[PDB]
Design a protein around this ligand. Structure first.
Ligand SMILES: [Mg+2]
Ligand SMILES: [Mg+2]
Ligand SMILES: [Mg+2]
Ligand SMILES: [Mg+2]
Ligand SMILES: [Mg+2]
Ligand SMILES: [Mg+2]
Ligand SMILES: [Mg+2]
Ligand SMILES: [Mg+2]
Ligand SMILES: [Mg+2]
Ligand SMILES: [Mg+2]
Ligand SMILES: [Mg+2]
Ligand SMILES: [Mg+2]
Ligand SMILES: [Mg+2]
Ligand SMILES: [Mg+2]
Ligand SMILES: [Mg+2]
Ligand SMILES: [Mg+2]
Ligand SMILES: [Mg+2]
Ligand SMILES: [Mg+2]
Ligand SMILES: [Mg+2]
Ligand SMILES: [Mg+2]
Ligand SMILES: [Mg+2]
Ligand SMILES: [Mg+2]
Ligand SMILES: [Mg+2]
Ligand SMILES: [Mg+2]
Ligand SMILES: [Mg+2]
Ligand SMILES: [Mg+2]
Ligand SMILES: [Mg+2]
Ligand SMILES: [Mg+2]
Ligand SMILES: [Mg+2]
Ligand SMILES: [Mg+2]
Ligand SMILES: [Mg+2]
Ligand SMILES: [Mg+2]
Ligand SMILES: [Mg+2]
Ligand SMILES: [Mg+2]
Ligand SMILES: [Mg+2]
Ligand SMILES: [Mg+2]
Ligand SMILES: [Mg+2]
Ligand SMILES: [Mg+2]
Ligand SMILES: [Mg+2]
Ligand SMILES: [Mg+2]
Ligand SMILES: [Mg+2]
Ligand SMILES: [Mg+2]
Ligand SMILES: [Mg+2]
Ligand SMILES: [Zn+2]
Lengths: 47, 98, 65, 63
RNA sequence: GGAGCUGUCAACCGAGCGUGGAUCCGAGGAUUUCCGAAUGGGGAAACCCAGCACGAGUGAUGUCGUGCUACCCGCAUCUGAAUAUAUAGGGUGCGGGAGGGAACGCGGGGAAGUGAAACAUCUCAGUACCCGUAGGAGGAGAAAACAAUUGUGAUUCCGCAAGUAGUGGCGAGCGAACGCGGAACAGGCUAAACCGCACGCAUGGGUAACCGGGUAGGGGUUGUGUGUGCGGGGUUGUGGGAGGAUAUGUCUCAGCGCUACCCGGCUGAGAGGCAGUCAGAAAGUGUCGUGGUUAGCGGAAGUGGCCUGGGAUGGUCUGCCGUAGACGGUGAGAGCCCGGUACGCGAAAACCCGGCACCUGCCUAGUAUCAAUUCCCGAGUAGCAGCGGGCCCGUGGAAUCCGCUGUGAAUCCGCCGGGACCACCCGGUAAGCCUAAAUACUCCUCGAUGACCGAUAGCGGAUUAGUACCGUGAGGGAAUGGU
RNA sequence: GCCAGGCCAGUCCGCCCAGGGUGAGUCGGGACCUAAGGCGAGGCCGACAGGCGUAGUCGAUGGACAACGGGUUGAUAUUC
């Protein structure tokens, strides 16, 4: 919650949890920035 | 709670007919529309400290008027014409000399 | 007009006389308004409000002040 | 007559009467309501009532 | 809350109020005409006429103000007609009901059009509608259940099972359950036998042989039996209780149970334990909440240059904030001009919820073993028959469930169910009551949203809208936005 | 007053605007009486809804009950 609030109202920036990733948001984004633990959690959830 | 005689009498009636009856020492008032003759007579005697020979009353309906598209009605009124006893002090309306 | 603070000291009979004389003033104001000699027409509302105030004080007195 | 019992409140029932062509029309099943001049204490005043033969057959009320 | 205000169509004025805090917003209280369930009596709703009591007024009638005066039901009391017991009825005093509301629930009554290419069985449909009656939900709910040789274990609702088994002028059609996966879970009181106390009838109207049992007596007459009420006891299906033989007291005190004793038992009090506004008993007084609801307040950052322009929120250079770049307004597309937004504070009082107390209530040994004689386990009930209703089931071989009529049991070696019926086996314990949650709905109040409408659209209704107007009436029912 | 209305026109108007105007012991009604009829305490009947009706109470178009003549206003008069 300390880091989500920081980029919350930046225009063009979209926030979502690793377990809510979806094709529409990925395809609309130009770059996907993962936090390290978020990326590890997403990878672990798929093995 | 307590009743005052001045709640029955509302205003004097100011008109040519009223002014004609002042010369005869007959006074016209607008009274509350649910009073009766005896009540009005008692109230006038108590308020103006004068003898009253008789009281006559009449109801009058309000007029219909249209303003934008539909009629509206004015209030109905009850007038009381009060004639004093032959030899009693005149009532000073304080601004109705006639 | 008259204040409730300055009305809450009159006992019962001064209240009853203030009521009666205020009613008399209202009667006179009504006749003056009818015959066209009243200039400050805001007096009617003031007298009506002080009469209402006197009733309010009396009623609250007789029901658990 | 008087299809309601004054003790147990037993009222009429509703059903169908069925002809040979199996055509069904509404009818009623009335309780067997009979008149009784009942007393409370023995030798007392009699009160008229409308009770069913089941209540009469039991000891519910006495003449 | 903080400088203007005296609502709107809808201005023109007039006259005033306001930092000694107005207008405005919230809460509590006061007043509250007449009609309306309308309820003193009457009545063409919004009107008319009273009676009683207490005050006001008059020389006295006249007059005025404030309370009470409908009917039915329940409870408590006084009276007890014909008429005797008595009852019907009557008087008094306390409580309650009535009427309305958009939907949702439960119980009852119950169409037709239509489909069957006609039509009557059937369908439509237990629908529309009507009647009774609720509650914030309701109903149902604790096995006289399913299952089938293993077993599950109150009810409700959702998904399957399944358009299946079936059922149908076997036509048109209609259509389960077993079981499986889920949401939510919770169980409790009574009747009866038997024991006590009042009221009732007998009987002894004294042989009661009873007065806690006994250890012995006396009063020896009130014992004995039955009914209606109030306490104890008891609540189960591997049957459980009651009553008998082995076994003993939450702790004390007093009283009573006839007298000295054993064993006790009952009542009252105190001492403890537990529970509580609950289905399992009901109210009320306090006090306290980082609790909630009903007003609100603060809240970062551009007077930037030039161009066009009536006007910059546009273009182009620059500066900045951001836990705030939601939305809207302002003279044209505004995070930085305004209301606000993120975020964070805020309650005299009233109401709601929670806690702690007060208070209220319950608990004053029976546990275990044996005996297996006796009593009890919800009656005009179950069952059976007739006629119907409803179940997949349209009467069929028709079980299970419900109604009316007749007939009419048994209390565990009983009774009921397992789809006619019989035998065996299995399951359960009807004819008494209560019970949260999971489910349904929105007249209404707040807060959001829309690949919804944009004035012939969207509500009938952006405009006087259920208005104008039409109809005796029930009813029907418009059009009208933009400097 | 004259732009709508009046089957033409209109200075007029039952049209539009403002103000004024209806005075009762005796007149017509109530506070008096009842008819046909209505409602209807209890009541009887009826599954419910409800039907009918006694006491009673409403209900004139009927019964009972006191005023005539003159004058006056722009508009009331058995009313002043
Ligand atoms: Mg008043
Ligand atoms: Mg006269
Ligand atoms: Mg008159
Ligand atoms: Mg006009
Ligand atoms: Mg009946
Ligand atoms: Mg049919
Ligand atoms: Mg029977
Ligand atoms: Mg206020
Ligand atoms: Mg208020
Ligand atoms: Mg009334
Ligand atoms: Mg009436
Ligand atoms: Mg007698
Ligand atoms: Mg009701
Ligand atoms: Mg048909
Ligand atoms: Mg057909
Ligand atoms: Mg056809
Ligand atoms: Mg309620
Ligand atoms: Mg319930
Ligand atoms: Mg008992
Ligand atoms: Mg008991
Ligand atoms: Mg602010
Ligand atoms: Mg320029
Ligand atoms: Mg803009
Ligand atoms: Mg914006
Ligand atoms: Mg601006
Ligand atoms: Mg059948
Ligand atoms: Mg059958
Ligand atoms: Mg039978
Ligand atoms: Mg079988
Ligand atoms: Mg049983
Ligand atoms: Mg129940
Ligand atoms: Mg429930
Ligand atoms: Mg429209
Ligand atoms: Mg348009
Ligand atoms: Mg009409
Ligand atoms: Mg003209
Ligand atoms: Mg013309
Ligand atoms: Mg009646
Ligand atoms: Mg009738
Ligand atoms: Mg009559
Ligand atoms: Mg009459
Ligand atoms: Mg007549
Ligand atoms: Mg004339
Ligand atoms: Zn019966």
């Amino acid at each position: 919650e300390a880091g989500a609030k920081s980029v919350r109202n930046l225009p063009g920036v979209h926030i979502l949890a690793p377990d809510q990733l979806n094709t529409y948001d990925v395809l609309r984004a130009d770059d996907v920035v993962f936090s390290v633990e978020a990326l590890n959690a997403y990878i672990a959830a798929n093995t | 709670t307590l009743a005052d005689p001045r709640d029955i009498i509302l205003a004097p009636v100011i008109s040519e007919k009223s002014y004609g009856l002042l010369d005869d020492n007959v006074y016209t008032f607008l009274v509350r529309p649910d009073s009766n003759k005896t009540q009005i007579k008692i109230a006038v005697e108590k308020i103006f400290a004068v003898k009253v020979a008789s009281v006559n009353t009449a109801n009058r309906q309000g007029k219909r008027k249209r303003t934008r598209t539909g009629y509206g009605k004015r209030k109905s009124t009850k007038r009381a014409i009060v004639t004093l006893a032959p030899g009693s002090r005149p009532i000073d309306l304080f601004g109705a000399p006639a | 007009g008259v204040s409730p603070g300055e009305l809450r000291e009159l006992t019962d009979e001064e209240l009853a006389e203030r009521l009666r004389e205020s009613k008399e003033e209202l009667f006179n104001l009504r006749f003056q308004m009818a015959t066209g000699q009243l200039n400050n027409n805001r007096r009617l509302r003031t007298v009506r409000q002080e009469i209402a105030r006197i009733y309010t004080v009396l009623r609250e007195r007789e029901l658990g002040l | 007559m008087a299809a309601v019992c004054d003790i147990c409140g037993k009222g009429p029932g509703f059903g169908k009467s069925v002809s040979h062509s199996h055509r069904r029309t509404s009818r009623r099943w009335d309780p067997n309501i009979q008149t009784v001049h009942a007393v409370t204490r023995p030798g007392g005043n009699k009160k008229r009532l409308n009770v069913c033969t089941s209540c009469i057959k039991a000891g519910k009320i006495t003449r």
